[model samples]
Target chain A: MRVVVIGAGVIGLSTALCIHERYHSVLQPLDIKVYADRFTPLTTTDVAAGLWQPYLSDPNNPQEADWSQQTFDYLLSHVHSPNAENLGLFLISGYNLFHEAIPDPSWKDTVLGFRKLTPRELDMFPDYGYGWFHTSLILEGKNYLQWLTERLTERGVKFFQRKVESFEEVAREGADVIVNCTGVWAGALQRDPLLQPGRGQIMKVDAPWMKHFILTHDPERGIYNSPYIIPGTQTVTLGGIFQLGNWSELNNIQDHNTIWEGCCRLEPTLKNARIIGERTGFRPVRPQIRLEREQLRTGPSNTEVIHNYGHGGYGLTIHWGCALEAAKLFGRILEEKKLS
Target chain B: MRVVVIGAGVIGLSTALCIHERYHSVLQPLDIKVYADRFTPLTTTDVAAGLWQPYLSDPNNPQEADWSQQTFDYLLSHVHSPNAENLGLFLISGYNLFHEAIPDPSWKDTVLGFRKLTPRELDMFPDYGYGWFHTSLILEGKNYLQWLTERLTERGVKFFQRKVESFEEVAREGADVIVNCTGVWAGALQRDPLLQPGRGQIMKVDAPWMKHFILTHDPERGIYNSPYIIPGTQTVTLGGIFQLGNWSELNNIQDHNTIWEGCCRLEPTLKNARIIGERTGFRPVRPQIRLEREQLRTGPSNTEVIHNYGHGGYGLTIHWGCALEAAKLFGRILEEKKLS
Candidate 1:
């Protein structure tokens, strides 16, 4: 099957890599090409903390929870492999602080360990009332994505850096199927106004002393005190305000100062660390992620399209799971068409 | 002395503030102008981790320590003042990891509190065999620049956004002594062939729980771990890599992952925090910072220009001290020329 994937993010890259690995050693090698104006760190994937905790997901959809559970498993598998160090998968203890009681579900059984915070554990927080604790996976997104891309390239995936302006233009390409994992840009595809840029700012520090990741809740400012202390690296990551549609790339002075002081309050050990730098990225946000299959009409050919996108800030969390589903759906279509 | 500073960096703003506060008051105003394309976050100083620890300075001169000490005191005087929040100073516990201890006379008697790391403290660093502890001052660069600019504006100083193609152009427009603090642009101005960019990328995170700052030397990577969690802010700044001459504004994937992983290794709690974003800036670096007064024979007027640029990565640490020397020289020239 000939396929064109329209993004190089975790989702698009994972899906491309999955399909390439599945068929490269089999029948006539499938023809596949990927187009993206940005790759890896340049994309929003570079902004994620890369937790499989599924921070922001569809609470109503049971499928999302299953996907997240499977995702946690997939990453853990890679971590146990001999090449885990090179692959950038690491096991991490994760803490999620919320103002309300966390809902427990069947998927909790799949996670390595999951539990609620004790009353004293709740006192560790200054103001928030409730929280949860779980063991999950943290991916060094940059290295992981780079490693994935290189692997796909070696497997015969053609890549393009040209900016794609139209969905119709993508349809013009003679691929039998076009995969749309364009994330927030789906607004441009469907000519819809549902997409928005959720702005976030963060900093990377060379802090090797902190081993547990902690996220807090600040209910007053509608802000969350998410001072995450990740294990296994020299630096700690601190963050940020989520402002919608704010395109200003410049750091806000008052906001900047507030962020510095906030992280210090979470861990006094950070006072001994040197600040490495600051960063900002816009989250491609839509109310919901798009993941489905469709058939499109072209001038002289019909094209099948499987869309897996619109993952605002949770792209990394559900990347592998959604991509796998998309791949399986593609396989079914190819099998029915007698093209595989 | 009538001085026109052509930048609002730590050097220019600090220099102008010192010279103005010393030479003129409300009754007597100095003819000083601050020329910059955009104020605050637009300048390189906006993104800098303005620590008062000098990493780079004049090798032969013992005065950098003296200058930084005095400047720190001057900034501390304004730290909590309602009017000085922008240019406010912060007293922070700092760590410096080094291969060998160099002279720190500037901080010895000049700072309020100074001390070295205990034997146990040194042992905390697995990668570094040597380390030191000291009370360091951090500049609220974002707010301080604005504060400094406002101070100048209130004193009837002219502000221009015009881009100077040549130093002679600025001199022709009624500038007596053009104090050059053009930073990395000095390579273009002085045509210094050795000048190049030192790129630093950082991540800013919201971690209010941290209050101490630490720095470590990583002998393997030829890099150091300096994770500082500062007070009076919500975000912790994680940084960085010294990539020389890399002018790409976009963040590299490996760099991002390395920063996140490295810091998380120190503090696992960071792995759970929400990631806001990432940032990158190019430091104007030269083998040596040029701090000299030059007589320019150009245009209709003979201008005596003092060049004080190329502090590079140490701009904040040594800015005021260097600017103080630059201003002193400027004062001597002003007395000799006796310009109206």
Candidate 2:
């Protein structure tokens, strides 16, 4: 069967890779083509620091914790793999600080060294009401995206650097099924108003001395007092600001100041770190992530479309797990279509 | 004549509008369409604070000065027009402060009220060496882009939200000529190795009290002690860092802090300004802006293509001028093809 996947961002790339890996043999040599206007540096996937933490997801979605756990396990396996270094997958220790009293993250059990901060440790953050520490994985998005692209190319999955304006355009290209992974563009493409751009700006700096990842949340300040400092192999990423319904791609100077001050408040040594670069991208935010099959009866006849987008800020955290679910949905649709 | 423009950023929109305005009557009912994968809130144009200052450009290019002058005049005309308020085009006073003594801006004559800073005014910046003040224009890109879109839509310029993977795609859709304004993507589309993304970050905040725009340069600290604090009708814009060949879109917290501290040093009141949002975008950079025509021998039936991109950070400053030149080239190509 010929399947077309839209988008070249993390979710789209992962979905395409997962579909090919699991279903290609089951379906006996599937024809999959990935289409996108942007890849790597241009997509929102590149803006992410790739910390494996679930933030801003639907609370009612029963499968969210499961998906995150599955993704955590999948990444954990990669950390010990022979190509771990090449894959840009590794473990990093970090803390999540909150100004309000809150429970440990629901998926804390999945992480190593997951525990609440001790009384002495909490005293360090006098302004914060609670804190938790854990060891998690950081997926350097640029390297990881490149790795996935190479792997997919070697497996014979064709990638077309074209933008799909409409699902009808995909059907016209003779695809039996189409997987929509357009992320922020999903709002316009799917005609769903619920989707919007939650703009986030981050900076990549050469601070090798910064070893751990830190997430700070200061609701009262409404600034970077809640910024996260995530370390990768070459540079550490300092971020971020969450502006809902904002579409601007320019970094706010105030946000930069806020992040720096916030980081310094947590660790004073970051004051002299050299700045390397900055990034801004929109999280494909929605009330809940959409990952289901839709049998379109509209434009093209008998075209099946499955959507896998709106993961928001946790795209990398749950990419693999969501891709697995999307792949399963893809298989079910194919089987049902054959019977019909 | 059928012309296809391949971007929707400031340059693309301005060029497409200019072509229609100047040549639509000459050509008599032209068919012009714009195609892009991203539009408002997603493009680099949206990220711009729309300050009318020529910071970086090729000094040797004779047309560079002319373009800046022409664009300055064009925007000047709009500042006093009947729809000025709706168009978000207005005049604002500001200063360009430098830590080292430098020659006045090359196009200083283009602006009104341009002068050197008084000794007392320079005294305020104790660390700086020299400074200049000028009354310039600010094009609030969000409103201006919307205004242009509305004008173009009223004139029947069709817009397709799709990515043009190959120039042949434009020809397949019945275009005799294609104006490539893909900006940073021009490197890939036109196979020009010299083109790259020069990244910049800026922030928008509700600082109505900021009356004048300020541009500061301090090379000693290798960071902005003097940064641009541009005031708009409703909000103020703080910027920025210029990272050449960097494509990441996340906001650098350090750069953010640097900008905030720098701006606060300039205007102490900004420390308490309410934060609104942040943005990041790539300035399409090359040694010289490519504003020329090329004949694609490989494409279907000899499609004449005019390239207009790589304006880098000066796109907002010189868009109208570049668009005028690009429009003239487009008209010349059409006339030549008609004669042939």
Candidate 3:
């Protein structure tokens, strides 16, 4: 079976990897081709701070938790591996400060270190009413995306630098099945009105003194007030700004100042941190992630289309889990074709 | 009288210009000093597309129109000047596309080449319900800000690279009056609870083919589909994303793609335009722009404060006008002091 995957972002790359690694025995002689107009730093996945938390997930979606847990476990295995440095996987401690009192995160049981902020720890942030401290996984995009590309290249997964406008375009290329992981672009391609851009801006800076991550959410005041410090091999990532349905790629100085001040407030020692660069990415947000199969009627011949986009801000957090589901969906479609 | 202006953005610089140009005669031996932590590209003014439109101005606020008109007339004089290139001022034509029907802009009579979209032009964009085309002014920040700085320098307006955390800091300088044009920072500095950040992202691309600006507002859809192409002397400015209260600075690839695709749709020749760079800036938005005076009590002494901030997205549009008003306010305050 010939397969074409759209998008080179975290979701697209992860889905392609899952199909090659897991379903190789089921679908023998699988010819896979990946298509994307941009790669690495030009992609939204590169702009992510790479925090493992399932941010902006739908509260009503049960599958979201399952998927996030699966990705967490997958990243955990990589953290223990000796190639962790090459993969840019590590565990870091952090606090999730909230304006109101709330229970611990559901994934607290799965992570290594989890606890409530003690009285002394709470004193550190008098502005925040309640918080939680936990050690979670972080995937540095600089290394991780490169590692994925290399692994997929070694597996002979053909990558084409092409922007697919329509499924008909891929169908004409003789692709038997197409998996759409186009992220925010899917809104235009599929005319899916539900999709919105959750625009985020984050910065990378040289802050070697920083040790822990921080999550601050103050919805009432309309300020995140938290600068999550995810340290990479060289520079640390300080973020971020969240603007729903915003699509500008430029970096703003006000945001830069806000992040710097917020980080300094959380850790005053970071007052002199040198900024390396800034990044802006948009999360492909929908009411819920679309992971379904459809048969496109191209008149004489019908084309099989499987969608796995709209992971919103959790593209990294739920990439592996969503990819696993997509692989299974592809397998089911193949079996149905055989039966028919 | 000695005066200190906080912020080196367009508003602060313009207010300083107005003071020296208009009020220097009344307030003889005028000593003026400007303070800001950042300058040039680091300032929000640098990130602006620099369109001379009264964007995000409150219709109810009569001063908004007066201020915007004042700035428009001020920019118009520079456009006809032989030194327009040095000042980074030029006239460009553009369209404001809307998903729903919108009445003529309030300042339609004031600007040049205002007209409804012809049926033939309307045929070009079937997605939009209506649009307006007009020739307006464009201010290229690379040269314009430098022009302002140099002009002020010629007049001996001293600039200090200091971040003023509190009013007390500037009061210590022994200035009789202080004009606060700190933009988004006013939320903390002046303790102005009404201030909000309207985050915008725009891109500068080498699209000499683009001759007009474009604006597409669809509040119902949560996407600004039109990428206003303001032709600069060297490169064209394409924007933008308007996210209110968002504070991120990282570049998002999806946004770049969307802006590229949207601009291409409006003008097919822009499909191959090479991107020069991207920028993001936060608009200091409030219910209405704050252009008033206050007397602060510091125990033994009192500090007279005049605020001219919170122009939201219209800092460039109404900057000169607001500056003129600030200059007049200074004059009035002086007369009141003399009467006392």
Candidate 4:
């Protein structure tokens, strides 16, 4: 089956890799191409602090929770692997705090060993009067993306970097199927009104002492402070500000100063550490994760195009499972086409 | 001499480091404190492509040219040093191709190795017709700033990571004289309407085979084809879009794609080479570089505050010379005060 994924983001790359592996033995020399306007380290994945806890996502669909669980299980299996270790996959104790109660139906059964925070751990934090404790996995998208790219290259996958104006342009490139994993870029694409940019500005600082992922739903402050210390080094990223549709990367001196000071309020030791870099990126968000297959109508021809995009912040969290599902659908279509 | 500098932009840190190294001795113990609002890697320097080529700064200021020259000599002396090599300091063969040639008096014999690009090189890049060659020294400000920080720290200079609101606040910290290097943030402190944000967006890619920096004057067509190679690393930083006062670090897909496509036109290798990242930064630029000392009186106290802010994009280029001048003046003031 000749398949072309339209983005090199987590969605496209993961989907392509899954399809490639599944059809490896069957489809006499499987031809798969990942076509992106841009590629690795340049995408939103670089700025993403991907955690396995599936909460505060598109609440309408429950699949995000399932996919999140599936991806965590997959990555957890390889956490001790040398490759995963290098990609910043270490066990971390995480806490999710909230002021008012909400139905955690999507989260309760999804993550392994999910429960309310113990009284001892609760006392450790100052303002957090209510919280939940769980064994969670944090995926450092930077290292992991690099590792994934290396894995894909070793498996003989072709990457074509090209800008397409429409679906027809993708079809012209001999793509039997085109997957639209364009993320926030989907807004500018043809008639896709669902996708929008949820702008987020974050500061990446070097604080060696911070080791846990602490999430707070501060209702009084009307600000959600997500303090997550990823697997690898001393860099602790503290942020959780969402300005919908704001396209600005310039660090607001006030915002930076505010967050830096806010970090000290959470962890006083941060005052001693040196800051590494300040960065910001927009998250591609939609009402739902758009996973669909469409048969393209060409002049005297038809082409299969399966699109799996709009994963937003959940792209890294649910990439593996979504990819597997996309590939499974692609295989069934190929079999049906062969019989036809 | 006991002195302190506020802000760690190219100017503040450079001045502090220069003064500490030149004045401090075993007999005359110097106490230096840099109460900077921000530090290295987090400074505007991180986003800058700090080459020694002088911007078209104030036409009347001859010191601007001297600053560029002094910085060049400093960078040239240590261009091949271990830190320089590690920081990717090397020659980037480039030019400022003017559509309408500027009067030679502005740049005449000021910059080292200044000449017109040979007709052969011009024919090689017909896209940009008229241009002049200048042997520019590109410094990776990210690494260089850290190097400066280390040098300052090693010289027994105390760094206070806090922002001072007013000159009185600086004096309250027990600093006799305060050096300001706040970059664009100076506007907030001084309430000077002249200072504004100059937004620059750049794409960092891994093109190991690329050599020589290319600059074009065609602003619309990206004359700064600076697809030029960095000295040490395979990471090639390519850009030249200066949007005045557009404080946005958020990477727009269109701008990123345009930058990528523009780069490909300059060097076809950039098209195929693996793209690493896209970054944007706001340069604190104004019509002039404000470098002077003033005696300030706030309420009941009088304090000396050395005004050495506003380097704009040329901070790294003339940082040392301006710093040397600032330090020299600072020493004379200290000698008069009997601190030295």
- C-alpha lDDT of residue B162 in model 1: 58
- Model 2 residue-pair collision total: 23
Candidate 4 residues lying further than 4 Å off, grouped into runs, are A56-58, A101-105, A110-112, A219-234, B1-340
Instruction: Assess each prediction's global lDDT (C-alpha) against the native.
Output: 0.67, 0.77, 0.75, 0.66
Each candidate's chain B TM-score? 0.85, 0.94, 0.93, 0.87
Model 1 spans with C-alpha error above 4 angstroms: A25-29, A56-58, A99-102, A105-107, A119-123, A218-232, A248-251, B1-340
lDDT tens per residue, model 2, B32-132: 89999889678888887788887632355778778988998877765544465556776565567776777777877777546677663455466576878
Stretches of candidate 2 above 4 Å error? A1-340, B56-58, B219-226
Residue B210, candidate 3: Cα error in Å is: 50
Q: Tell me the spans in candidate 3 whose CA falls farther than 4 Å from its real position.
A: A56-58, A221-226, B1-340
Model 2 complex DockQ against the native: 0.01
Better of 1 and 3 by lDDT: 3
Q: Rank the candidates by lDDT, best first.
A: 2, 3, 1, 4
Tell me which residue pairs clash in candidate 4. A248-B250, A249-B249, A249-B250, A250-B249, B7-B36, B213-B228, B216-B223, B216-B224
> Could you give the DockQ of candidate 3?
0.01
- The CAPRI classification for model 3 reads as incorrect
lDDT of 1 by residue, B1-340 (tens): 4567877777778777767776674323368887876566677777766666654333445665566566666665544333433354544554566556555544454443345554544543455566555445677557667777788778677777856677877788776778887887776656887677788777777543343455555444443234433332335777747767788867888887877776665544566556676777778877667788988998776887888887777777777778778868877886776631
lDDT by residue (tens digit), candidate 4, A164-256: 677777677576777777778875655677777766666776643233466777645543334333322336676766666677856777667
- How far residue B273's Cα lies from its native spot in candidate 2, in Å, is 0.8
DockQ of each: 0.01, 0.01, 0.01, 0.01
